[PDB]
Design a protein around this ligand. Structure first.
Ligand SMILES: [Mg+2]
Lengths: 237, 135, 79, 190, 254, 97, 169, 67
RNA sequence: GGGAUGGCUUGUGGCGGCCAAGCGUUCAUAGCGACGUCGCUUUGAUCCUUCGAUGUCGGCUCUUCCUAUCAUACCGAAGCAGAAUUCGGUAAGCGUUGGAUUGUUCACCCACUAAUAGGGAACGUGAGCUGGGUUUAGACCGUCGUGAGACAGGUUAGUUUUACCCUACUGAUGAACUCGUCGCAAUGGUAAUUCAGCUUAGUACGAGAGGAACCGCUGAUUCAGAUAAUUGGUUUUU
RNA sequence: CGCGGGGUUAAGGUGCCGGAGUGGACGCUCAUCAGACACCACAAAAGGCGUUAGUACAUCUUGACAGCAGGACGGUGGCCAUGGAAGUCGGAAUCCGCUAAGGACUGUGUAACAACUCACCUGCCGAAUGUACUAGCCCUGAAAAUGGAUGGCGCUCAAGCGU
């Protein structure tokens, strides 16, 4: 068969003789069936069903409110900026996150054991949080590498939000300025929550009052990269 | 359609996986190394084994170089392990041998050297038409 | 489901002492935390609560409103 | 809330006899006689008027009051069955293989038996036995039609449902394969 | 042969539900905080890898099932261009392939992070992060999946036309008897009605002449205006006339 | 942890315990269900197993490969001298059997 | 022990750390333009600079190609092209006239055929042995990346009997 | 009564009339009473009554109320 | 001389903004806020970017359990014509296999197949056997150390050896009720499984290519219980 | 808190195990493993055509809710677009007449029409209803792995829940 052959069959021969009445009876039984599903389903299936019914009820109430209310930009932009997708756009020199949870050194460092005996030497420590190692990085040789910063936990870029411009751009990390828990953590370059980092803001188009281009600024990490797998930062402007 | 043929009575299987049989056609191969048997069941540790009339998957260990790098369906036409037919006769051939076929049953070669089994001839009409002795 | 013909493992309603003690400790910690959060709560609260009033199915609500008018008039006359 | 008193009324035609004892309702008419055991429902039967049967429930809940409507409709259906009867007309349609329907009456059991052959070319013979008191005839006025008549509406409709469900199409597109036996008409014999 | 063997293309939400239900049900779900950290890492790494493998199987099936327009005969390639807008076709399939690659990259990254996670809570957060990012990538494919499902249904109902066989190609204006001629000579079920453009797609029937199989192609009508003004329905006929080496039967109603 | 490769259990638990039978003579556990509309007949007999031998059978089994062909089958011989009937037992039905 | 992880208020957090002038940007762009490669000079310390503002942009064909798909989707959404609510009536053609269509069909048939003979010129086969997968193991490449991360100088060794064969690009 | 029929909500333009239609009919009849010399009462029983439009169009000088 | 997190977990990311039914507030108009939505994280490409063992697993042999169902049984839906499927529901009755690779996180390949589903009973420390994490004493090689020696490490060789006890389990006897024969059946256990071929039928369906099913018939796979006429094997029939 | 006898209680209990009530009054609940030592978590402003008690707003003999019998029209095939598109593939407007009332249309349908249907209105009938929230009890609101636990039997106008 070719093209709309089922539609052609419906035109030529119709449907089954009980199809209309059985569809009407099933649509009439939908109310009892939905109540039975609400009172009898179990587990994750029941939870998903209840959530999706909650969504349907919210959408239906919105539609009814709109049908009741049938009988009744923000920032000034030029003509060439009209009809485009524009952002909504919403002394004490305090950072947005002045205090975070402190990290102990046993949480930061785990002991790496070495040796072939049953008793092991335990002088090596491994950093368990994401770090920034900076450019031109070569690891110390293994005989003198006390602190291990694994390559899988190294980050070079972060999602930085400008609070005023209401934009989020992925920017390269320039340096780690201050880890709030320990200067040793700052020296190792650990990227945790509340950390002040230096970011490249060339893509944000910031121009100083004298006409120079500001390509390096400060951001604060607002997330937990060890839990999220990404670094989220807010510019300190 | 998989290669296991229907209407086959139970017989003693004499060729497990890893057996090398002779190659009874003129396709250019000299021997066939069994790596699988079509229609084999599932049982712990049991080697899949075939008999006369069964389709196996086989590699070529010696013969023409263009047949050495491919896996071919084959039909076992002779086996050396004795087996019984429904007429009460126990019998065996002096060697193990098969012929290379396609999955549909037609042979790659054009002639068969030596006899073929009655089971193989009855199950595969192309082998029965290319057999000089049905035996 | 085939619950009647083939029931599954029963869910025990018999408690354990460890779970009872843990639940009691968590309830005490939760009520202390609610007291602390209510103390630290910055939500606005009115000095006078919104009174619901007199129910409509009360058959003498009209006479109650008459009494309220008469009492307010008498209080205004006295003051 | 428990309702102190609730009642329903059923009129009885002139040629209809009704006898109720221990909630066992027997209704006899020109066409025959029917029985129904209603002892699973708490109801007080009475003769409120000449030719009117009264149904009462005392100190009952909403569920118990609502059950009296079902009892009323059941007794009215028995009365209609013994007065006018019930008739279901069914049609069998086909595309290529003509459906062969044979109707016989089993002498030992006293029930009708319907044999269906060549349903979409199938070699099996479908056999469906009617409820007692239900007569099946192949219609002569219309093409490919069965008529099931009786005094019991439940028996007639259930026999029609069994014939409808025995010819089920499996593992085929039902938008394309339209073959089957369907209830085409419901009504009274008279 | 045809294109009826393409598996059904779900929506974004159905895709997410299918993948997450496979992850939830075909794998164990109970893990304890008191277990070994290697056991916890293996549990969550297996969850992430299984989710990615299910996504990869579905996306690869979608990519390998649909026709490749560069590998078709010019008639089939230009017919698919007329019917489905080859640009939109290639864009949707490229989005599918890009999402598959991105999901594999996220799986590799989060498996690498799960190698170094130190607790069940951190492992759970990393697993949820990976599956949430995959769900976001699938949610960004709402329109191409619907478009590809419609294209799949039309391709399944498309007739099979061999471009290198004996072919009688019937063309002309509407309402001149093309479908009547094709119904007379072949067994094809093409409608015959008195209004213009009754036939809106290519139909094909078959006849036997001197023990040989001939295919006959019924076409929509063609009007007298240039190719920039011709629509898709007439351009099916124009594509058939341009790319099929056949015998043209141009019908005239005098 | 779970078993890595599935395999069915050895032997059937339906034939437990694998002990010696309590009697040398076999026991009919169940006789056929009685139909009073049938004529009277005896449901069982005794014999003594003598040995085995070989036959050739001309097979009439339509649909089989050995149809209209000779087949060799193993058979068992049971020596059956005629029994002697010496008694009659009556059984009633009780709520204990 | 858990420390007090606190950040003091400071005016330095809200200032620019690195600035650059337009003249310096022009000088660095000219240096980038005239930069050449010398095998006998090595890089010892990179200069921290805005490469995004210094290096040149991509080619115009690449810039158009990276946005053609999004541009076509913005011009015509998927729902207006095919489906129950599609409004597409005029197809997009690579030809304008009937003569151009005839020439295009001839060239398309020639190209289809030529691709067919090229593919022709270019039972299941036995699987490739696992011995030929040596040197591709995750453990081996973990070792390689560990050595690369540890080393300053990398001696890449080439067999003289097959140097380009043994080169690792 | 938790077990009840779910009322369908109509997403249609025309709403129920209510008391203002009754008041409008009152005002229309009471304002057309003094303008006319005669008031006939007519009956159309068990009829489709779609030809009252034609009757109204033919008797353009008269006023017809069918409320 | 001591010592050897837990009614946890599961399917849907984080940060930032906006909207928001609702909660509060209506001497302040702030503050919480689901459902959502927007930003950051290849025209079906590329294959010249594999990113760190402190955490150790295996294998047989055998039994049982869970369901979060791969297959088999039934059912609902989809342009589902047919065929092959896909999504989902009830369902653990019954199955779920060889094999290759130890330059190595042994995990991935190839095949047969109805299908080659996932877990628990250890790994919330732990005497069946046997390879790796693995490590007494002998020995080289690399790194460190003036050295004794220690390790970033790599390699080789290397001592634990019950059961006759109680219980459990599998079988076997048995006192008291004279001995024996024929029986009943409470209770416990319980069993079959899947595929193929002939016919239906080149039929329904289909433009063509292709292409079923119910009834009927015959074999085979896995399992189970027996048996020795025949064919093999076994020989102290010495 | 010495060793004993008699009496009375506390906490907890009185269907049987188990001493003491199948005690009394008024209600609520039926669970496909209810509940009986709950407060914590799952868990939400959560899902229920389960069952009662309330609150607020609204309709109603000038006839409310439900039904049945009928009407559902005219400018008009409104504008643009489309091969075709007439309320019903789309984009935007969405007014007037006749009105008792009828949308520049709620769905089915046609290639387009036609046809059917809904909103709304009239006739018949006959007295109470409708919506949204709140409080009780009930169901769901996630579970693994030997066979088991309100302590056990069992209990349904309780031997459950509130006083
Ligand atoms: Mg025409």
């Amino acid at each position: 068969p070719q093209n709309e052959y089922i539609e052609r069959h419906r035109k030529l021969h119709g449907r089954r003789l009980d199809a209309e009445e059985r569809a009407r009876k099933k649509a009439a039984r939908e109310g009892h069936k939905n109540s039975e599903n609400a009172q009898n389903l179990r587990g994750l299936r029941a939870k998903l069903y209840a959530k999706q019914r909650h969504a349907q009820k919210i959408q239906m109430r919105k539609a009814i409110k709109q049908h009741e209310e049938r009988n009744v930009p923000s920032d000034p932009i030029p003509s060439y900026l009209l009809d485009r997708a524009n952002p909504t756009t919403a002394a004490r020199f305090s950072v947005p996150i002045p205090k975070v949870r402190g990290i102990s050194e046993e949480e930061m460092f785990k002991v790496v054991k070495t040796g072939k005996k049953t008793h092991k030497k335990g002088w090596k420590r491994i950093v368990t949080k994401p770090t920034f190692v900076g450019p031109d990085f070569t690891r110390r040789p293994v005989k003198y590498e006390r602190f291990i910063r694994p390559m899988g936990l190294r980050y070079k870029k972060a999602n930085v939000t400008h609070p005023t411009l209401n934009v989020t751009v992925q920017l390269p990390i320039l340096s780690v300025k201050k880890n709030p828990s320990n200067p040793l953590y700052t020296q190792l370059g650990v990227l945790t929550k509340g950390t002040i980092i230096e970011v490249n803001v060339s893509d944000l188009g910031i121009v100083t009052a004298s006409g120079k281009i500001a390509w390096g600024r400060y951001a604060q990490i607002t997330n937990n990269p060890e839990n999220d797998g990404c670094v989220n930062a807010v510019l300190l402007v | 359609k998989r290669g296991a043929p229907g209407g086959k009575l139970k017989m003693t299987l004499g060729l497990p996986v890893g057996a090398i049989m002779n190659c009874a056609d003129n396709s250019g191969a000299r021997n066939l190394y069994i790596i699988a048997v079509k229609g084999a069941g599932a049982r712990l540790n049991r080697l899949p084994a075939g008999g006369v009339g069964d389709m196996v998957m086989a590699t070529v260990k010696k013969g023409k170089p263009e047949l050495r790098k491919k896996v071919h369906p084959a039909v076992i036409v002779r086996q050396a392990k004795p087996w019984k037919r429904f007429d009460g006769v126990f019998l065996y051939f002096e060697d193990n041998a098969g012929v290379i076929v396609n999955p549909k049953g037609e042979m790659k070669g054009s002639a068969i050297t030596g006899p073929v089994g009655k089971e193989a001839a009855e199950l595969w009409p192309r082998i029965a038409s290319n057999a000089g002795v049905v035996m | 489901a085939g619950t009647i013909n083939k029931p599954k493992k029963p869910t025990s309603k018999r408690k354990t002492t460890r779970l009872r003690a843990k639940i009691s400790k968590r309830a005490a910690e939760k009520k202390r935390k609610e007291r602390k959060l209510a103390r630290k709560n910055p939500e606005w609260r009115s000095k006078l609560k919104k009174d619901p009033g007199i129910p409509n199915l009360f058959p003498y609500k009209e006479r109650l409103l008459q009494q309220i008018e008469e009492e307010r008039i008498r209080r205004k006359e006295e003051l | 809330m428990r309702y102190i008193h609730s009642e329903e009324t059923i009129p009885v035609p002139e040629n209809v006899k009704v006898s109720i004892k221990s909630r066992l309702v027997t209704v006899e008419g020109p066409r025959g006689k029917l029985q129904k055991d209603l002892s699973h429902i708490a109801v007080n039967f009475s003769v409120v008027k000449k030719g009117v049967i009264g149904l009462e429930i005392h100190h009952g809940s909403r569920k118990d009051v609502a059950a009296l409507r079902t009892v009323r409709t059941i007794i009215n259906n028995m009365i209609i069955g013994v007065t006018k009867g019930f008739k279901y007309k069914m049609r069998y349609v086909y595309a290529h293989f003509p459906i062969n329907v044979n109707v016989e009456k089993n002498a030992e059991t006293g029930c009708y038996e319907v044999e269906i052959r060549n349903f979409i070319g199938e070699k099996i013979v479908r056999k469906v036995v009617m409820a007692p008191g239900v007569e099946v005839e192949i219609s002569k006025a219309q093409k490919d039609e069965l008529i099931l008549s009786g005094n019991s509406l439940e028996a007639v409709s259930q026999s029609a449902a069994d014939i409808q469900q025995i010819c089920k199409v499996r593992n085929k597109d039902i938008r394309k394969f339209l073959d089957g036996i369907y209830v085409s008409e419901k009504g009274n014999i008279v | 042969t045809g294109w009826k063997d393409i598996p059904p293309v779900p929506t974004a939400q159905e895709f997410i539900d299918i993948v997450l239900s496979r992850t939830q049900r075909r794998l164990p779900t109970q893990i304890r905080p008191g277990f070994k950290i290697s056991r916890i890492r293996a549990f969550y790494t297996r969850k992430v890898k299984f989710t990615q493998e299910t996504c990869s199987e579905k996306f690869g099936a979608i990519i390998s099932s649909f026709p490749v327009l560069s590998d078709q005969h010019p008639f089939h390639r230009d017919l698919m261009n007329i019917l489905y807008d080859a640009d939109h076709f290639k864009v949707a399939l490229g989005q599918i392939s890009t999402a598959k690659n991105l999901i594999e990259t996220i799986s590799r990254d989060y498996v690498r992070l799960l190698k170094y996670a130190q607790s069940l809570y951190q492992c759970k957060q990393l697993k949820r992060a990976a599956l949430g990012r995959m769900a976001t990538l699938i949610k960004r494919l709402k329109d191409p999946l619907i478009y590809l499902d419609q294209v799949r249904q039309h391709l399944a109902r498309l007739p099979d036309i061999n471009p290198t066989t004996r072919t009688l190609l019937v063309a002309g204006f509407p309402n001149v008897g093309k479908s009547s001629f094709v119904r007379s000579v072949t067994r094809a079920d093409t409608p015959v009605e008195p209004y213009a453009f009754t036939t809106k797609s290519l139909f094909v029937g078959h006849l036997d002449y001197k023990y040989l199989r001939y295919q006959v192609i019924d076409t929509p009508g063609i009007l007298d205006h240039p190719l920039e003004e011709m629509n898709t329905i007439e351009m099916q006929s124009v594509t058939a006339l341009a790319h099929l080496r056949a015998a043209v039967l141009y019908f005239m109603d005098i | 942890s779970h078993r890595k490769y599935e395999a069915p259990r050895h032997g059937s638990l339906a034939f437990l315990p694998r002990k010696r039978a309590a009697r040398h003579r076999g026991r009919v556990k169940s006789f056929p269900k009685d139909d009073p509309k049938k004529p009277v007949h005896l449901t069982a007999a005794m014999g003594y197993k003598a040995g085995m031998t070989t036959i050739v059978r001309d097979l009439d089994r339509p649909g089989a490969k050995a149809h209209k062909k000779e087949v060799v089958e193993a058979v068992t011989i049971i020596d059956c001298p005629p029994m002697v009937v010496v008694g009659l037992v009556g059984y009633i039905e009780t709520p204990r059997g | 022990e858990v420390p007090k992880a606190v950040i003091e208020p400071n005016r330095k957090w809200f200032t620019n750390t690195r600035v650059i002038s337009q003249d310096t940007l022009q000088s660095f762009r000219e240096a980038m333009a005239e930069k050449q490669k010398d095998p006998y000079t090595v890089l010892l310390k990179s200069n921290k600079l805005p490469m995004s503002l210094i290096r040149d942009g991509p080619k115009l064909e690449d810039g158009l190609k990276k946005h053609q798909a999004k541009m076509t989707i913005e011009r015509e959404p998927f729902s207006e092209t095919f489906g129950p609510k599609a409004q597409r009536k005029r197809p997009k053609l690579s030809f304008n006239t009937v003569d151009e269509l005839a020439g295009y069909s001839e060239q398309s048939l020639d190209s289809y055929h030529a691709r067919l003979e090229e593919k022709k010129l270019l039972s299941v086969a036995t699987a490739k042995e696992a011995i030929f997968n040596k040197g591709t193991s995750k453990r081996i490449w973990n070792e390689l990346y560990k050595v690369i991360d540890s080393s300053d100088v990398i001696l890449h060794v080439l067999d003289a009997r097959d140097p380009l064969g043994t080169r690792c690009r | 009564p938790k077990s009840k029929r779910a009322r369908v909500y109509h997403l249609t333009q025309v709403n129920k009339k209510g008391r203002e239609a009754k008041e409008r009919l009152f005002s229309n009849i009471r304002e057309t009473i003094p303008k006319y010399q005669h008031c006939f009462v007519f009956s159309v029983d068990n009829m489709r009554n779609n030809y009252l439009k034609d009757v109204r169009h033919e008797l353009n000088d008269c006023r017809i109320f069918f409320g």
